[PDB]
Amino acid sequence: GAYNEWKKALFKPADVILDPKTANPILLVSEDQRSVQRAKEPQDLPDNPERFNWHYCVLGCESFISGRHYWEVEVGDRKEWHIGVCSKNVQRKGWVKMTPENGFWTMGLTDGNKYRTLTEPRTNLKLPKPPKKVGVFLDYETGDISFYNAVDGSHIHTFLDVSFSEALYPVFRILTLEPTALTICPA
Ligand SMILES: C/C(=C\COP(=O)(O)C(Cl)(Cl)P(=O)(O)O)CO
DSSP: OHHHHHHHHHSEEOOOOBOGGGSOTTEEEOTTSSEEEEOSSOOOOOOOTTSOSSSOEEEBSOOBSSSEEEEEEEOTTOSOEEEEEEETTOOOSSOOOOOGGGTEEEEEEETTTEEEEOOSSOEEOOOSSOOSEEEEEEETTTTEEEEEETTTOOEEEEEOSOOOOSOEEEEEEOOSOOSOOEEEOOO
16 A cells, blocks of 8 residues: 555665575576576585575675665465564574574465464464565565565565664575476566
């Protein structure tokens, strides 16, 4: 609605491209670095320090330490996906639960129709329609991370008044083998 339109006018549109050096080896990062898909088997890649070696995650190339930013992600009909932001210093080696206290502010979909916010404990979301494009608002100084349906502007979830102390990266996670990719909408 009009509030979402006000916010998109205030917040700076971010041009997010995926960083292949961060992507778990089971992930396929597209050549234009806008899309991510899951491979049948892990790729033969180094275990460089930037790479998630357990979680099926990939980061954007640029992080945020200030300001108001937003980007939109086409999830389409994909039956499983989680997106949001995470701190630069999240645990990338070995499993960690993706939670705000561990530096992840994310939400998404499992099993086709189970929407969750990845809070601790996880919160189930009641969405009136399944989103096909999802917008992410980041307001660094106030500490707000918000998710919205990018087509009709309706609300999905707000993380409210977080105290950020690190740079923040867009983060993307996909677990399933299925033909629909995740694609970032360009700024
Ligand atoms: C197997 C993987 C994620 C499953 O995540 P996970 O076991 O941490 C969970 Cl089931 Cl706790 P989540 O979906 O609630 O985060 C690889 O990224």
